[PDB]
């Protein structure tokens, strides 16, 4: 696709570069998660690495959780409750933000799988 929304897992340690859209943004959830990473780091070396990861989003669009994302989160949440399937709540916020903007979620990990086929949801595994 033309654009996509990176989740937190793409920032963590190669990616399938061919599948990354031409233009990328992330969300405030990932900003939060990378920041908690810096604050939780046990040793300077890890702290320095994680601090570089946090800094890598400094110029990048960080999409907020706004009203449209909130409405989407509710729809996706009930979809999951009915099916008896689960997603990390912070991953659901990410998916809600992306879906509400009709953008795919770009992920390195396996959490968004439960949402495949939900309206406005497109997951790209890298």
């Amino acid at each position: 696709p033309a654009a996509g929304v990176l989740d937190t897992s793409v920032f963590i340690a190669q990616l399938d570069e061919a599948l990354i859209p031409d233009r990328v943004a992330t969300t405030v959830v990932t900003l939060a998660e990378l920041r908690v990473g810096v604050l939780a780091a046990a040793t300077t070396d890890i702290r320095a690495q994680r601090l570089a990861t946090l800094e890598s989003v400094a110029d990048m669009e960080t999409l907020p959780v706004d009203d449209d994302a909130a409405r989407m989160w509710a729809r996706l949440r009930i979809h999951l409750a009915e099916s008896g399937r689960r997603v990390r709540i912070n991953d659901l916020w990410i998916a809600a933000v992306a879906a509400s903007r009709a953008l795919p979620v770009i992920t390195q990990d396996d959490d968004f799988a439960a949402l495949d086929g939900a309206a406005s949801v497109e997951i790209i595994r890298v």
Partner: protein, 34 residues
């Protein structure tokens, strides 16, 4: 803050990936499911 090109992003990210252990820390801190 702007939409990064694929090459731009991959330039900012390469050499700046978090340690694999961040997955562990995030499971503890933000691993709560629906």
């Amino acid at each position: 803050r702007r939409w990064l090109s694929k090459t731009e992003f991959l330039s900012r990210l390469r050499g700046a990936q978090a340690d694999p252990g961040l997955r562990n820390d995030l499971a503890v801190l933000a691993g709560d499911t629906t």
